Amino acid sequence: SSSVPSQKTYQGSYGFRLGFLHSGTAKSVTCTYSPALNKMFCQLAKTCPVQLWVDSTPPPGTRVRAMAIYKQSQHMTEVVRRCPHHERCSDSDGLAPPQHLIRVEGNLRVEYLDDRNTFRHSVVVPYEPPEVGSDCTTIHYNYMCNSSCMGGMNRRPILTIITLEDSSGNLLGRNSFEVRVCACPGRDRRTEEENLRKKG
Amino acid sequence: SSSVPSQKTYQGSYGFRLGFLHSGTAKSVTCTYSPALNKMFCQLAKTCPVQLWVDSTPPPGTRVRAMAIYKQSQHMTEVVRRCPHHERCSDSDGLAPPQHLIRVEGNLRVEYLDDRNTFRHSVVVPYEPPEVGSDCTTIHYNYMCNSSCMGGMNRRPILTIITLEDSSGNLLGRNSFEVRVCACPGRDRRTEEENLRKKG
Amino acid sequence: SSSVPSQKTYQGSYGFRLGFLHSGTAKSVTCTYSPALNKMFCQLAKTCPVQLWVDSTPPPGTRVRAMAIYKQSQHMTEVVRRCPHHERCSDSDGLAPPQHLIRVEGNLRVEYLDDRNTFRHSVVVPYEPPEVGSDCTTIHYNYMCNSSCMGGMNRRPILTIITLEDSSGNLLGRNSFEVRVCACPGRDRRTEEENLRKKG
Amino acid sequence: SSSVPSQKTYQGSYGFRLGFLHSGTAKSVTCTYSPALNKMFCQLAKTCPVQLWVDSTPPPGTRVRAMAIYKQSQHMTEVVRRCPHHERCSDSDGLAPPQHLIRVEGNLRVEYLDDRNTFRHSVVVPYEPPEVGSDCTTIHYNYMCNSSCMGGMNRRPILTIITLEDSSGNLLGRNSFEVRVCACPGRDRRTEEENLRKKG
DNA sequence: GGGCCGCCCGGGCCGCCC
DNA sequence: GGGCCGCCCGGGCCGCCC
Ligand SMILES: [Zn+2]
Ligand SMILES: [Zn+2]
Ligand SMILES: [Zn+2]
Ligand SMILES: [Zn+2]
């Protein structure tokens, strides 16, 4: 069986999709999302709000998992991890293992997992339905390396795969988006969108 | 579950809303409220009158809680607290813990709380209905740091979240407003309203 | 007896004077010295090289002490200390008490002292004569607060007093210089020198 | 006493000086030396031949030590070491500790040392006099990180300090040169020499 | 050899003195 | 009320792809 998790969109029977805030492209905005590229541009260790939208209410005990894979076929089989420099940084919140790229902040029930067969990292929180009058629930993710980090992602693009899973382990829905963690998200989003228009 | 309290307005079945006095924008007025920005501008440790308005009378034992959160997504998970300088100031009224930003003055039944899971501070008083002939009840809040304080809010905007809660802990209503604690509330309100008009 | 150490220059029988490197006034240079003002401009926690020049060799066991006092008569009696914010910072090198403003880096025999009568802080290293062919010895000082720090120096200028002391405690020589610890030493040096010329 | 080794040239009673090969400035030459800058430009882990020249023959048991320090006063006190990424690389020759920046290749009597007081690294070989008819002896040094390495030198220039020491520990001579380890030594030497001419 | 991403840089934007 | 210091900001400056 494959050791590479699927990235295939599966909005499923609950109508699961992601949403992202409108942030603009000021040069050093902390986080911004390109709909044309389905790509988040964000700064190291800065809050990245991701909205969970469903048409139908998931069952009690549903979980939300996030995991990173390399986007390019050439690198898919390599586990996405923090680089050695940032791994040794004294920046752990007391729960995230220092090797994990993706953290969740602001959640009292976060779980960090290492797959015993694929060695891949993931971070899980319970799914909570929106407040009355609200249409979505927001998770604050953090990416703890730049895409460029030597000895880590080393300029290779990643996908974040968000899965909605019931307590039994059934896949209720899947979505994914590309991530670039970089110093100047607004500059780099504009550059990549312009290159898409000019040369894509 | 989230460690960030919701800011979502919930005027609820009792028709709960806040009111603020008309104060003007003389440069150093002690407290002034901008309806356009839903924002209070006030000076450190000065009285900030907040009115509670309801259409229907809350049940006996209802309580009024105030808590601060950072407004920006990037800072929401950080607990709002006093800076180290003002924390060591001998300005405690004998009841407020020195780390708490928000105090209530002039109430014999004030309670200061530290959440055992989120570590967030709040201050609670009993809800009292208006006097006959009066349409609202007023609480005098104090903010014990400037928004700019180094090692505390450090120029980051906060929201104050006011909740009306029954004795059992049900949320009866919720309102919130932005706060800037600053040396010159009248100047800064005018500046922010003008920037809204010109560049918002 | 006075609790304020003397600032009076005493170059003494060994011909003791200080020297400073030529650094220029690029806006954010880390450290720069104004001869006209006898004033060092430097950034928080950045190396400040100070040269010790003597005409005659001090005796074995000579010590070099540095201490800060407020320059203005109105503040001389207050002990110069780190502000509460930086005092709680996890920036101690394992030897300097967190309250001390002045540190010495790169010396295996540094001693930090608190005066039991005046409560004033000082930092001492052994005097070592220059290498053959060299005319001076250099100490790397660090200032661990900005001059502007709220709850610390709070925009008040300080003097650093450097004393050459024999092992018995005799004062062999004294020199002093003004210090401004600031974000932009080059800007601020130029500003202060221009104000001296225009308005001094 | 200082934890920073002296860089002061001391050609001494044996007339000790260094020599470097003429290599040119082809863009990616592996190693090239700028006399104007007293600076070696070389690639990671590539051979850097350094010549030892003496006028008088050192005594038996003389040793040659190489050590790196940061050139800028602001960084002198920090120990120069390999970055975390290259430290975990399986590139050890069986003798050099993985944390050491400077290695010697091609010598059966190399010794790697960690100073118990300063924690600084050095690498030592016995001094051997030139062959009859030869005027110098050559040591092949290797630098195991780029000057730019994140978490290591991080774009900060270093000096290599070469000391000639007798077996008793007397300093017989000292020389030093700046090093830049980089991808394109020929480009970067030309750039730095041109900037010296134009803006130095 | 030509040329394409983190960070440095001078310009300019909130408590307190007058 | 007028006006005088830390930090944000867009412009632009080294390993690696071609
Ligand atoms: Zn990293
Ligand atoms: Zn404060
Ligand atoms: Zn301070
Ligand atoms: Zn390296």
mmCIF file with all atom_site columns, all heavy atoms in Angstrom, chain A residues 103-118:
data_model
loop_
_atom_site.group_PDB
_atom_site.id
_atom_site.type_symbol
_atom_site.label_atom_id
_atom_site.label_alt_id
_atom_site.label_comp_id
_atom_site.label_asym_id
_atom_site.label_entity_id
_atom_site.label_seq_id
_atom_site.pdbx_PDB_ins_code
_atom_site.Cartn_x
_atom_site.Cartn_y
_atom_site.Cartn_z
_atom_site.occupancy
_atom_site.B_iso_or_equiv
_atom_site.pdbx_formal_charge
_atom_site.auth_seq_id
_atom_site.auth_comp_id
_atom_site.auth_asym_id
_atom_site.auth_atom_id
_atom_site.pdbx_PDB_model_num
ATOM 1   N N   . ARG A 1 103 ? 1.650   23.082 13.328 1.00 0.00 ? 103 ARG A N   1
ATOM 2   C CA  . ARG A 1 103 ? 1.055   23.134 14.648 1.00 0.00 ? 103 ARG A CA  1
ATOM 3   C C   . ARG A 1 103 ? -0.347  23.722 14.578 1.00 0.00 ? 103 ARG A C   1
ATOM 4   O O   . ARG A 1 103 ? -0.711  24.400 13.613 1.00 0.00 ? 103 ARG A O   1
ATOM 5   C CB  . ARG A 1 103 ? 1.891   23.971 15.608 1.00 0.00 ? 103 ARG A CB  1
ATOM 6   C CG  . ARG A 1 103 ? 3.292   23.474 15.754 1.00 0.00 ? 103 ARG A CG  1
ATOM 7   C CD  . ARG A 1 103 ? 4.021   24.289 16.799 1.00 0.00 ? 103 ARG A CD  1
ATOM 8   N NE  . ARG A 1 103 ? 5.424   23.915 16.914 1.00 0.00 ? 103 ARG A NE  1
ATOM 9   C CZ  . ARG A 1 103 ? 6.319   24.583 17.638 1.00 0.00 ? 103 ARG A CZ  1
ATOM 10  N NH1 . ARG A 1 103 ? 5.967   25.658 18.307 1.00 0.00 ? 103 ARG A NH1 1
ATOM 11  N NH2 . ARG A 1 103 ? 7.574   24.167 17.683 1.00 0.00 ? 103 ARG A NH2 1
ATOM 12  N N   . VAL A 1 104 ? -1.126  23.448 15.615 1.00 0.00 ? 104 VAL A N   1
ATOM 13  C CA  . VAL A 1 104 ? -2.394  24.121 15.860 1.00 0.00 ? 104 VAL A CA  1
ATOM 14  C C   . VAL A 1 104 ? -2.251  24.893 17.162 1.00 0.00 ? 104 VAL A C   1
ATOM 15  O O   . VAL A 1 104 ? -1.848  24.326 18.186 1.00 0.00 ? 104 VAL A O   1
ATOM 16  C CB  . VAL A 1 104 ? -3.577  23.145 15.932 1.00 0.00 ? 104 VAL A CB  1
ATOM 17  C CG1 . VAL A 1 104 ? -4.848  23.863 16.397 1.00 0.00 ? 104 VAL A CG1 1
ATOM 18  C CG2 . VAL A 1 104 ? -3.823  22.473 14.588 1.00 0.00 ? 104 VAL A CG2 1
ATOM 19  N N   . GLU A 1 105 ? -2.549  26.183 17.116 1.00 0.00 ? 105 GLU A N   1
ATOM 20  C CA  . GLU A 1 105 ? -2.551  27.024 18.301 1.00 0.00 ? 105 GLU A CA  1
ATOM 21  C C   . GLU A 1 105 ? -3.973  27.249 18.787 1.00 0.00 ? 105 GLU A C   1
ATOM 22  O O   . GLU A 1 105 ? -4.932  27.186 18.015 1.00 0.00 ? 105 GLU A O   1
ATOM 23  C CB  . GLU A 1 105 ? -1.877  28.366 18.014 1.00 0.00 ? 105 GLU A CB  1
ATOM 24  C CG  . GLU A 1 105 ? -2.553  29.163 16.907 1.00 0.00 ? 105 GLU A CG  1
ATOM 25  C CD  . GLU A 1 105 ? -1.929  30.524 16.699 1.00 0.00 ? 105 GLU A CD  1
ATOM 26  O OE1 . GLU A 1 105 ? -1.716  31.239 17.698 1.00 0.00 ? 105 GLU A OE1 1
ATOM 27  O OE2 . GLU A 1 105 ? -1.634  30.877 15.545 1.00 0.00 ? 105 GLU A OE2 1
ATOM 28  N N   . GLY A 1 106 ? -4.104  27.499 20.085 1.00 0.00 ? 106 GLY A N   1
ATOM 29  C CA  . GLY A 1 106 ? -5.391  27.883 20.631 1.00 0.00 ? 106 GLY A CA  1
ATOM 30  C C   . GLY A 1 106 ? -6.408  26.781 20.750 1.00 0.00 ? 106 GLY A C   1
ATOM 31  O O   . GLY A 1 106 ? -7.613  27.046 20.668 1.00 0.00 ? 106 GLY A O   1
ATOM 32  N N   . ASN A 1 107 ? -5.969  25.539 20.928 1.00 0.00 ? 107 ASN A N   1
ATOM 33  C CA  . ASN A 1 107 ? -6.901  24.440 21.075 1.00 0.00 ? 107 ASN A CA  1
ATOM 34  C C   . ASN A 1 107 ? -6.428  23.529 22.196 1.00 0.00 ? 107 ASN A C   1
ATOM 35  O O   . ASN A 1 107 ? -5.291  23.048 22.171 1.00 0.00 ? 107 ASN A O   1
ATOM 36  C CB  . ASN A 1 107 ? -7.045  23.645 19.772 1.00 0.00 ? 107 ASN A CB  1
ATOM 37  C CG  . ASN A 1 107 ? -8.225  22.706 19.793 1.00 0.00 ? 107 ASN A CG  1
ATOM 38  O OD1 . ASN A 1 107 ? -8.275  21.761 20.588 1.00 0.00 ? 107 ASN A OD1 1
ATOM 39  N ND2 . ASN A 1 107 ? -9.200  22.960 18.927 1.00 0.00 ? 107 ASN A ND2 1
ATOM 40  N N   . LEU A 1 108 ? -7.315  23.288 23.155 1.00 0.00 ? 108 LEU A N   1
ATOM 41  C CA  . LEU A 1 108 ? -7.002  22.520 24.348 1.00 0.00 ? 108 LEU A CA  1
ATOM 42  C C   . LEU A 1 108 ? -6.976  21.019 24.101 1.00 0.00 ? 108 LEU A C   1
ATOM 43  O O   . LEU A 1 108 ? -6.661  20.267 25.025 1.00 0.00 ? 108 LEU A O   1
ATOM 44  C CB  . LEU A 1 108 ? -8.032  22.818 25.440 1.00 0.00 ? 108 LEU A CB  1
ATOM 45  C CG  . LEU A 1 108 ? -8.187  24.290 25.834 1.00 0.00 ? 108 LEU A CG  1
ATOM 46  C CD1 . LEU A 1 108 ? -9.452  24.479 26.660 1.00 0.00 ? 108 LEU A CD1 1
ATOM 47  C CD2 . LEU A 1 108 ? -6.972  24.733 26.590 1.00 0.00 ? 108 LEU A CD2 1
ATOM 48  N N   . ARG A 1 109 ? -7.328  20.553 22.906 1.00 0.00 ? 109 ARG A N   1
ATOM 49  C CA  . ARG A 1 109 ? -7.426  19.118 22.652 1.00 0.00 ? 109 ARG A CA  1
ATOM 50  C C   . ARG A 1 109 ? -6.604  18.713 21.432 1.00 0.00 ? 109 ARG A C   1
ATOM 51  O O   . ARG A 1 109 ? -6.930  17.736 20.752 1.00 0.00 ? 109 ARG A O   1
ATOM 52  C CB  . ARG A 1 109 ? -8.884  18.696 22.495 1.00 0.00 ? 109 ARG A CB  1
ATOM 53  C CG  . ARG A 1 109 ? -9.681  18.799 23.793 1.00 0.00 ? 109 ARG A CG  1
ATOM 54  C CD  . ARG A 1 109 ? -9.268  17.715 24.775 1.00 0.00 ? 109 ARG A CD  1
ATOM 55  N NE  . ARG A 1 109 ? -10.129 17.689 25.958 1.00 0.00 ? 109 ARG A NE  1
ATOM 56  C CZ  . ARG A 1 109 ? -9.943  18.454 27.028 1.00 0.00 ? 109 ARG A CZ  1
ATOM 57  N NH1 . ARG A 1 109 ? -8.928  19.308 27.068 1.00 0.00 ? 109 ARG A NH1 1
ATOM 58  N NH2 . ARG A 1 109 ? -10.771 18.369 28.061 1.00 0.00 ? 109 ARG A NH2 1
ATOM 59  N N   . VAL A 1 110 ? -5.528  19.437 21.149 1.00 0.00 ? 110 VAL A N   1
ATOM 60  C CA  . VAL A 1 110 ? -4.688  19.124 19.997 1.00 0.00 ? 110 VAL A CA  1
ATOM 61  C C   . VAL A 1 110 ? -3.899  17.849 20.268 1.00 0.00 ? 110 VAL A C   1
ATOM 62  O O   . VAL A 1 110 ? -3.393  17.639 21.384 1.00 0.00 ? 110 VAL A O   1
ATOM 63  C CB  . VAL A 1 110 ? -3.755  20.306 19.686 1.00 0.00 ? 110 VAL A CB  1
ATOM 64  C CG1 . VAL A 1 110 ? -2.922  20.671 20.900 1.00 0.00 ? 110 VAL A CG1 1
ATOM 65  C CG2 . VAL A 1 110 ? -2.837  20.007 18.508 1.00 0.00 ? 110 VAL A CG2 1
ATOM 66  N N   . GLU A 1 111 ? -3.778  17.001 19.240 1.00 0.00 ? 111 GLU A N   1
ATOM 67  C CA  . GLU A 1 111 ? -2.996  15.774 19.300 1.00 0.00 ? 111 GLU A CA  1
ATOM 68  C C   . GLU A 1 111 ? -2.010  15.768 18.142 1.00 0.00 ? 111 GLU A C   1
ATOM 69  O O   . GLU A 1 111 ? -2.392  16.037 16.997 1.00 0.00 ? 111 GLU A O   1
ATOM 70  C CB  . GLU A 1 111 ? -3.891  14.526 19.241 1.00 0.00 ? 111 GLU A CB  1
ATOM 71  C CG  . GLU A 1 111 ? -3.145  13.224 19.527 1.00 0.00 ? 111 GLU A CG  1
ATOM 72  C CD  . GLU A 1 111 ? -4.048  12.002 19.509 1.00 0.00 ? 111 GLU A CD  1
ATOM 73  O OE1 . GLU A 1 111 ? -5.161  12.090 18.954 1.00 0.00 ? 111 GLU A OE1 1
ATOM 74  O OE2 . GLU A 1 111 ? -3.638  10.946 20.043 1.00 0.00 ? 111 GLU A OE2 1
ATOM 75  N N   . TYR A 1 112 ? -0.749  15.448 18.439 1.00 0.00 ? 112 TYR A N   1
ATOM 76  C CA  . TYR A 1 112 ? 0.290   15.313 17.429 1.00 0.00 ? 112 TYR A CA  1
ATOM 77  C C   . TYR A 1 112 ? 0.620   13.839 17.257 1.00 0.00 ? 112 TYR A C   1
ATOM 78  O O   . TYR A 1 112 ? 0.844   13.137 18.250 1.00 0.00 ? 112 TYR A O   1
ATOM 79  C CB  . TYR A 1 112 ? 1.540   16.107 17.838 1.00 0.00 ? 112 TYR A CB  1
ATOM 80  C CG  . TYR A 1 112 ? 1.313   17.591 17.780 1.00 0.00 ? 112 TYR A CG  1
ATOM 81  C CD1 . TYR A 1 112 ? 0.819   18.276 18.876 1.00 0.00 ? 112 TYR A CD1 1
ATOM 82  C CD2 . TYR A 1 112 ? 1.565   18.308 16.619 1.00 0.00 ? 112 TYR A CD2 1
ATOM 83  C CE1 . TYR A 1 112 ? 0.574   19.642 18.821 1.00 0.00 ? 112 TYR A CE1 1
ATOM 84  C CE2 . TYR A 1 112 ? 1.331   19.667 16.557 1.00 0.00 ? 112 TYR A CE2 1
ATOM 85  C CZ  . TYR A 1 112 ? 0.843   20.331 17.656 1.00 0.00 ? 112 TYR A CZ  1
ATOM 86  O OH  . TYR A 1 112 ? 0.608   21.692 17.590 1.00 0.00 ? 112 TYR A OH  1
ATOM 87  N N   . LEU A 1 113 ? 0.642   13.375 16.010 1.00 0.00 ? 113 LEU A N   1
ATOM 88  C CA  . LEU A 1 113 ? 0.772   11.961 15.710 1.00 0.00 ? 113 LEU A CA  1
ATOM 89  C C   . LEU A 1 113 ? 1.941   11.730 14.771 1.00 0.00 ? 113 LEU A C   1
ATOM 90  O O   . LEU A 1 113 ? 2.193   12.535 13.866 1.00 0.00 ? 113 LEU A O   1
ATOM 91  C CB  . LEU A 1 113 ? -0.519  11.420 15.079 1.00 0.00 ? 113 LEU A CB  1
ATOM 92  C CG  . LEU A 1 113 ? -1.728  11.662 15.987 1.00 0.00 ? 113 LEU A CG  1
ATOM 93  C CD1 . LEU A 1 113 ? -3.013  11.316 15.243 1.00 0.00 ? 113 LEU A CD1 1
ATOM 94  C CD2 . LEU A 1 113 ? -1.624  10.867 17.276 1.00 0.00 ? 113 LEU A CD2 1
ATOM 95  N N   . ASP A 1 114 ? 2.652   10.627 15.001 1.00 0.00 ? 114 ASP A N   1
ATOM 96  C CA  . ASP A 1 114 ? 3.666   10.103 14.094 1.00 0.00 ? 114 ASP A CA  1
ATOM 97  C C   . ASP A 1 114 ? 3.192   8.732  13.623 1.00 0.00 ? 114 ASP A C   1
ATOM 98  O O   . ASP A 1 114 ? 2.990   7.835  14.445 1.00 0.00 ? 114 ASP A O   1
ATOM 99  C CB  . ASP A 1 114 ? 5.022   9.972  14.797 1.00 0.00 ? 114 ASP A CB  1
ATOM 100 C CG  . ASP A 1 114 ? 5.715   11.313 15.012 1.00 0.00 ? 114 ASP A CG  1
ATOM 101 O OD1 . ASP A 1 114 ? 5.069   12.249 15.508 1.00 0.00 ? 114 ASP A OD1 1
ATOM 102 O OD2 . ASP A 1 114 ? 6.912   11.421 14.679 1.00 0.00 ? 114 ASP A OD2 1
ATOM 103 N N   . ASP A 1 115 ? 3.014   8.571  12.320 1.00 0.00 ? 115 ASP A N   1
ATOM 104 C CA  . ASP A 1 115 ? 2.517   7.313  11.782 1.00 0.00 ? 115 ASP A CA  1
ATOM 105 C C   . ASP A 1 115 ? 3.575   6.221  11.926 1.00 0.00 ? 115 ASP A C   1
ATOM 106 O O   . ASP A 1 115 ? 4.710   6.383  11.477 1.00 0.00 ? 115 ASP A O   1
ATOM 107 C CB  . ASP A 1 115 ? 2.154   7.498  10.320 1.00 0.00 ? 115 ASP A CB  1
ATOM 108 C CG  . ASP A 1 115 ? 1.364   6.325  9.760  1.00 0.00 ? 115 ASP A CG  1
ATOM 109 O OD1 . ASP A 1 115 ? 1.973   5.272  9.492  1.00 0.00 ? 115 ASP A OD1 1
ATOM 110 O OD2 . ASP A 1 115 ? 0.134   6.465  9.582  1.00 0.00 ? 115 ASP A OD2 1
ATOM 111 N N   . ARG A 1 116 ? 3.210   5.094  12.541 1.00 0.00 ? 116 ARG A N   1
ATOM 112 C CA  . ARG A 1 116 ? 4.242   4.097  12.806 1.00 0.00 ? 116 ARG A CA  1
ATOM 113 C C   . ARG A 1 116 ? 4.725   3.399  11.537 1.00 0.00 ? 116 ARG A C   1
ATOM 114 O O   . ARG A 1 116 ? 5.812   2.811  11.554 1.00 0.00 ? 116 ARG A O   1
ATOM 115 C CB  . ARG A 1 116 ? 3.758   3.066  13.827 1.00 0.00 ? 116 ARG A CB  1
ATOM 116 C CG  . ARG A 1 116 ? 2.698   2.119  13.350 1.00 0.00 ? 116 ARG A CG  1
ATOM 117 C CD  . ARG A 1 116 ? 2.418   1.059  14.419 1.00 0.00 ? 116 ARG A CD  1
ATOM 118 N NE  . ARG A 1 116 ? 3.251   -0.139 14.294 1.00 0.00 ? 116 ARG A NE  1
ATOM 119 C CZ  . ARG A 1 116 ? 3.315   -1.108 15.208 1.00 0.00 ? 116 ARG A CZ  1
ATOM 120 N NH1 . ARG A 1 116 ? 2.616   -1.021 16.324 1.00 0.00 ? 116 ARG A NH1 1
ATOM 121 N NH2 . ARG A 1 116 ? 4.084   -2.167 15.013 1.00 0.00 ? 116 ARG A NH2 1
ATOM 122 N N   . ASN A 1 117 ? 3.979   3.476  10.433 1.00 0.00 ? 117 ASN A N   1
ATOM 123 C CA  . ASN A 1 117 ? 4.404   2.848  9.186  1.00 0.00 ? 117 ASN A CA  1
ATOM 124 C C   . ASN A 1 117 ? 5.023   3.818  8.188  1.00 0.00 ? 117 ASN A C   1
ATOM 125 O O   . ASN A 1 117 ? 6.001   3.458  7.525  1.00 0.00 ? 117 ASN A O   1
ATOM 126 C CB  . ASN A 1 117 ? 3.225   2.139  8.519  1.00 0.00 ? 117 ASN A CB  1
ATOM 127 C CG  . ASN A 1 117 ? 2.714   0.981  9.340  1.00 0.00 ? 117 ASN A CG  1
ATOM 128 O OD1 . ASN A 1 117 ? 3.486   0.132  9.781  1.00 0.00 ? 117 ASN A OD1 1
ATOM 129 N ND2 . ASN A 1 117 ? 1.411   0.955  9.573  1.00 0.00 ? 117 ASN A ND2 1
ATOM 130 N N   . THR A 1 118 ? 4.453   5.017  8.025  1.00 0.00 ? 118 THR A N   1
ATOM 131 C CA  . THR A 1 118 ? 4.956   5.992  7.059  1.00 0.00 ? 118 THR A CA  1
ATOM 132 C C   . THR A 1 118 ? 5.862   7.034  7.696  1.00 0.00 ? 118 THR A C   1
ATOM 133 O O   . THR A 1 118 ? 6.533   7.779  6.971  1.00 0.00 ? 118 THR A O   1
ATOM 134 C CB  . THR A 1 118 ? 3.800   6.733  6.379  1.00 0.00 ? 118 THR A CB  1
ATOM 135 O OG1 . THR A 1 118 ? 3.219   7.622  7.332  1.00 0.00 ? 118 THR A OG1 1
ATOM 136 C CG2 . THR A 1 118 ? 2.740   5.784  5.878  1.00 0.00 ? 118 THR A CG2 1
#
